[PDB]
């Protein structure tokens, strides 16, 4: 084993690699959303830029797992980054609904990793998850839920004026 | 009696303690409104922050009565702060209507205290009320009434787009 | 359930609401202490301002629980804020002794909530408690204990000169 | 009558002149206290300077009544400024006790003038009293009472060390 490795279970190492792939998957889905909202026949630029920012964030989340793996003496093992589930995202409401589920999927995986870390008596990995990931997920989920609420209030999906207003007044940088 | 006490009727002292409790009650009701508008299924953040600010104001109003009581040689006597009348506040219109009635209840109590102070020939307490409270109440009542007018114009309670517009254009910090 | 809610047990949600009430209760007790030490026949202003500051802190602690509840998709439910146990607080020693017990009551409730969160496998709530509350409690308890030690050294309750010296040299802003 | 005079009763004009004399009397008493505490066999300089400051304040209070009288079209009529009741003031406690009674005498006279003004339906004179005098009296009375409390706590009159400590830690500029 690595000279640095101490109290780091094989199962946690593998789970970190799986998590990294999921972060990368989330990044790629948000890129798809960005591109959709930048289409000339969609054209909700502030929405698009929100998704772009989230794509970037998720990619940083992935980088931080790679660094974590090496710090603990584990070995980064990459897998294919699967393409997003959809090619087209309907409208701002549908996209936000998809983003909420994505975030909850990410969160569940983080929570599962934390439970594994707990089981294996790995306080360092717990702390990393709690300090760098779990609160950010709560924040994202809350923000997106709040957006959904507003989109529904604004009459989505039918009310185009409402969709326009949201893009112009909600999606603050 | 206190060495400082001069021209301060027992009835005014007691009425000051009652008023203090009412200020605290008002603060707590506005906190409830804040929390309601911060819910993920409500999500009107600027509305929420308006109520939060008013909660803070009312708590300062209470502190100022405590200081006043001691300055005059009276004794602060606290009672339970009753929970707000509702757990849920419907929508921005219903909440603003409740806030208007709350402010008018506060104002009536202030006016009643002023009449007591007058009756007891206490110019100092009159002046305090006039200089620190009565004008602020008029301002609040006016602001909230103006909001109600606008909320009705915007189609509340039914018109969700109108509610959204209000949150984004009216509730200035 | 709320669209945001994920891994948040009903029991934890209720316990958060109870905790919030206790923070508010602590705030109100410290306000009472402030008012007592501001009395003309007590007149220990720096002591009074220490308690005032703690009142404000506790109220901020309460606000942070309200925000936490909403972030997790729970629902804030308020109860009456009970009046403090005493109307009068004796002297600086008695008050500090009461404040120590108050802080320990708060701490015990936080520790109990953490144990519940642990039992329910809620790392997010653990982290919140550990990062925002538990260390602050240790600090407060230590500070107040240190004050008690000094008050006893200074001859409280009998030694008025000692009480005066404490107010003028210990209770630093 | 003066060309400016409007709604100004002869009784109020005379009462203003009496009040002015009382302000001047208060000033002169505080000067006496200053001189006593500056004696080489008393030597409590910070105490002395507190009284000096109050002497100056009272003299400004008198000036403001003179200006008020002329503004309303009354005529300033001066009387002798009587010497203070004592030549010697004992100690810091005795002096503060005398200052408390002096302030309460001043306050009573102000309150009496306000009642006269009320009776004569003179809102301008009411307002002047409330805005320029009555709150300052409450503040002074409170401050001095607080000092008395502390002086008693410190063991006055017998405890010279306590008197010294008060001069060095209480009588802030
Ligand atoms: Cl290992
Ligand atoms: Cl598709
Ligand atoms: Cl985080
Ligand atoms: Cl706009
Ligand atoms: Cl009285
Ligand atoms: Cl309700
Ligand atoms: Cl006002
Ligand atoms: Cl849940
Ligand atoms: Cl009691
Ligand atoms: Cl902490
Ligand atoms: Cl010192
Ligand atoms: Cl006239
Ligand atoms: Cl004499
Ligand atoms: Cl004044
Ligand atoms: Co752009
Ligand atoms: Co992520
Ligand atoms: Co990067
Ligand atoms: Co983020
Ligand atoms: Co905000
Ligand atoms: Co108020
Ligand atoms: Co405050
Ligand atoms: Co008046
Ligand atoms: Co205001
Ligand atoms: Co202060
Ligand atoms: Co607290
Ligand atoms: Co606050
Ligand atoms: Co931690
Ligand atoms: Co603290
Ligand atoms: Co000097
Ligand atoms: Co004066
Ligand atoms: Co001058
Ligand atoms: Co006035
Ligand atoms: Co003054
Ligand atoms: Mg090797
Ligand atoms: Mg392995
Ligand atoms: Mg933009
Ligand atoms: Mg495929
Ligand atoms: Mg954190
Ligand atoms: Mg007494
Ligand atoms: Mg009474
Ligand atoms: Mg805002
Ligand atoms: Mg009840
Ligand atoms: Mg005014
Ligand atoms: Mg729902
Ligand atoms: Mg439940
Ligand atoms: Mg201080
Ligand atoms: Mg009770
Ligand atoms: Mg910490
Ligand atoms: Mg003429
Ligand atoms: Mg005349
Ligand atoms: Mg000095
Ligand atoms: Mg004579
Ligand atoms: Mg004033």
Q: 3-class secondary structure for chain A?
A: CCCCCCCCCHHHHHHHHHHHHHHHHHHHHHHHHHHHHCCCCCCCHHHHHHHHHHHHHHHHHHHHHHHHHHHHCCCCCCCCCCCCCCCCCCCHHHHHHHHHHHHHHHHHHHHHHHHHHHHCCCHHHHHHHHHHHHHHHHHHHHHHHHHHHHHHHCCCCCCHHHHHHHHHHCCCC
Residues bordering ligand 44, an ion, CB closer than 5 Å: C 3
Distance (Å, whole) CA A3 – CA C148: 51
Q: Select the residue of B2, B73, B83 nearest C80 (Cβ to Cβ).
A: B83
Nearest to C91 by CA among C159, C31, C138, C23: C159
Distance (Å, whole) CA B130 – CA B157: 36
Q: How far is CA C22 from the centre of its chain?
A: 8
End-to-end CA separation in angstroms for chain B: 45
3 state SS of C66:
helix
Top residue of C43, C90, C170 to mutate, by most chain D CBs within 10 Å, is C43
Contacts of B70 in chain D (CB under 8 A): 142
Sign of CA dihedral B17, B19, B20, B25: positive
Distance (Å, whole) CA A145 – CA A138: 11
Q: Tell me how many degrees the CA angle D32-D35-D83 measures, rounded to the nearest 5.
A: 20
The range of the structural domain enclosing residue D5 comes to: 1-173
Which residues does residue B81 pair with via DSSP β-bridges, in sequence order? C81
Provide CB contacts within 8 A for B157, sequence distance 6+: B90, B91, B93, B94, B163
Distance (Å, whole) CA D41 – CA A129: 73
Nearest to C72 by CA among D106, D110, A142, B33: A142
Longest Cα–Cα distance of chain B, Å, equals 61
Contacts of D106 in chain B (CB under 8 A): none
D vs B contact (3+ beta-carbon pairs below 8 A):
yes
Overall residue count recorded for chain B in this entry: 173
Distance (Å, whole) CA B164 – CA D137: 52
CB contact at 8 A, D66 and D17: no
Q: How far is B160 from chain A (nearest CA, A)?
A: 5
Q: How far is A21 from chain C (nearest CA, A)?
A: 22
Task: Give the tokens for residue A30.
Answer: 């948000």
3-state helix, strand, coil in chain C (%, to 5): 70, 0, 25
Distance (Å, whole) CA C49 – CA C46: 5
A166: domain CATH number is 1.20.1260.10
Q: Distance of CA C25 to CAs B152, C30, C137, D86, Å?
A: 38, 9, 15, 52
Q: Select the residue of A100, A114, A139 nearest C123 (Cβ to Cβ).
A: A114
Contact A145 C3 (CB under 8 A): yes
Q: How far is A160 from chain B (nearest CA, A)?
A: 11
Contact B70 D141 (CB under 8 A): no
Q: How far is D88 from chain C (nearest CA, A)?
A: 26
Nearest to A29 by CA among A78, A108, A97, A76: A97
Secondary structure in 3-state letters for chain D:
CCCCCCCCCHHHHHHHHHHHHHHHHHHHHHHHHHHHHCCCCCCCHHHHHHHHHHHHHHHHHHHHHHHHHHHHCCCCCCCCCCCCCCCCCCCHHHHHHHHHHHHHHHHHHHHHHHHHHHHCCCHHHHHHHHHHHHHHHHHHHHHHHHHHHHHHHCCCCCCHHHHHHHHHHCCCC
Q: Distance of CA A87 to CAs A37, A53, A83, A94, D7, Å?
A: 12, 19, 9, 13, 85
**Spacing, Cα D66 to ligand 32 middle (Å):** 21
Quick one: closest CA in A to B163, which residue? A153
Distance (Å, whole) CA B23 – CA B60: 9
Q: How many CB atoms lie within 10 A of CB C85?
A: 12
Identify the DSSP state of C81.
B
Q: Which ligand is nearest to the CA of D140?
A: 33
Deposited experimental method: X-ray
Q: Which residues of B touch A (CB under 8 A)?
A: 40-43, 45, 160-161, 163-165, 168
CB contact at 8 A, B87 and C77: yes
A vs B contact (3+ beta-carbon pairs below 8 A):
yes
Q: Which residues of C touch D (CB under 8 A)?
A: 40-43, 45, 160-161, 163-165, 168
How many domains in chain A?
1
Q: Which ligand is nearest to the CA of C132?
A: 10
Which residues does residue C81 pair with via DSSP β-bridges, in sequence order? B81
């Amino acid at each position: 084993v690595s000279q640095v490795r101490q109290n780091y279970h094989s199962d946690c190492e593998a789970a970190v690699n799986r998590m990294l792939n999921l972060e990368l998957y989330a990044s790629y889905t948000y890129s798809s959303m960005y591109a959709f909202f930048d289409r000339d026949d969609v054209a909700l630029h502030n929405v698009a830029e929100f998704f772009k920012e989230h794509s970037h964030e998720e990619r940083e989340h992935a980088e931080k797992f790679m660094k974590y793996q090496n710090k603990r003496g584990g070995r980064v093992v990459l897998q294919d980054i699967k393409k997003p589930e959809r090619d087209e995202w309907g409208n701002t409401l549908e996209a936000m609904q998809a983003a909420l589920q994505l975030e909850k999927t990410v969160n569940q995986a983080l929570l599962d990793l934390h439970k594994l870390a707990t089981d294996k008596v790995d306080p360092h990995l717990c702390d990393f998850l709690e300090s760098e990931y779990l609160e950010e997920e709560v924040k994202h989920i809350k923000r997106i839920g709040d957006f959904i609420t507003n989109l529904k209030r604004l009459g989505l999906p039918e009310n185009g004026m409402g969709e326009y207003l949201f893009d112009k007044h909600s999606v603050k940088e």
